[model samples]
Target: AQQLTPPAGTFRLGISKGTDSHWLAPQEKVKGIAFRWKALPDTRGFILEVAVTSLQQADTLFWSFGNCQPDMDINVFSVEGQAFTCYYGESMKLRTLQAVTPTDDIRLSNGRQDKTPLLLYESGKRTDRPVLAGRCPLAANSKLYFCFYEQNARADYNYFMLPDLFAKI
Candidate 1:
C-alpha cells in the first residue's frame, strides 16, 4: 500500500498545488508526459478530467470517484498505449472500456485499434504484479480516492506518447 503524504493544511478551496489537498493541477507534467489534469473535490469525492496536452477536446477521458451515491459509473478510456493504474481501498465497479472517440481522425493514424474486450484475470492485490481485481465503500461522503504515478517500469506515464502495452496488455 502506498502512503499519502499528509498536507500541511488538510486541503481547502482554490488552494495551490501541493498545499492544502492532494488534488492535481489543471496543467501538469508527469514523468515528462505533458498533459492537463483537472481534479475538483467536493464534499463527496472528486471529479477528474484528462487530456493529451497537444490536443484539444479533453473530453475523451473523464472520471468521478467517491460518488458511491447510487454507485455511479466509473468511466475510463483504456485506449492503446495509454495505460493508467487505479488503486482501490474501497468497494468500486469499473464500467469496462468499450466506447471509442467520437471522431476517428485521431486513432493514431495506423493499425492496432483492436476492438476486443478484456476480463479481470481474477487474483489478489499485489504491488509488483498485474491482475488487480478488487472491491469499494458509500454515496456522497464516501471516502473514495485514487492516485496515478510516474515511472518507467510500466511505461504508461503519458496519454499522448505512451508505451506499447498491447504486447499482451
Candidate 2:
C-alpha cells in the first residue's frame, strides 16, 4: 500500500453552518477530539468537505472526499457562481465538457469508457490537469466541515490526495 503524508505548512479544519449559511469556521481550538493530517508532497491543495448530522448527538452523515479548489475557474463545476471540481482516481479521462454559471449542479461522464464520472473545469491556460468539484446533500441540523492547505502540488500523480484518518466521518 502507498503511504500518504499531509501537506506541509499551516492548515485549518473547520465546520460550516450547514447549507443555510455556507460559511466555514476554522477550528483554531477544540476541546475533546484530536484531528490530525499528513503532508503529501505529490498532491495538490484540495478541499475536503463532509456532512455530519451532529457534532455530539446525531448520527453523522456519510463523508465524501474530493479534489476541490476555490480560486481556480478551470475544470470546475460552478454552483451559485462558485467553481469547483472533484476526482475519484488518478489519470482521469474527461469526455464532453459543459458548464452553466449560477447553476445548482454539474456532471461529467464518458459513455464509452469504463470510468467513474469526474466533475471538472479547464482553463486551457495554466495546466492541462482538470480541477475537481462536487456537492453533498445537506440535512437539517447537519454541518459541513472542510480542510484546505495553502500550498498544494499542481499534480497528484499518485492517489495520495485522499488521506486515511482516524476521525473520518
Q: What lDDT does candidate 2 reach at residue 101? A: 21
- TM-scores, all candidates, are 0.17, 0.23
lDDT of 2 at 137: 40
Model 2 misplacement above 4 A:
1-22, 30-34, 42-54, 57-73, 77-169
Clashing pairs in 1: 11-20, 68-139, 69-139, 90-135, 90-136, 91-135, 91-136, 91-137, 92-136
Model 1 has a clash total of: 9
What is candidate 2's lDDT per residue for 1-169, written digit by digit as tens? Answer: 1122223222212232332212123443222222333333443433333334334422212111223333333333232333323322224543122221222332232212212222111112333433332333434444343433333335644455445432353
lDDT for each of the candidates? 0.23, 0.29
Model 1's TM-score against the true structure: 0.17
lDDT of 1 at 136: 20
The whole-model C-alpha lDDT of candidate 1 against the native structure comes to 0.23
Best by lDDT: 2
lDDT of 2 at 168: 59
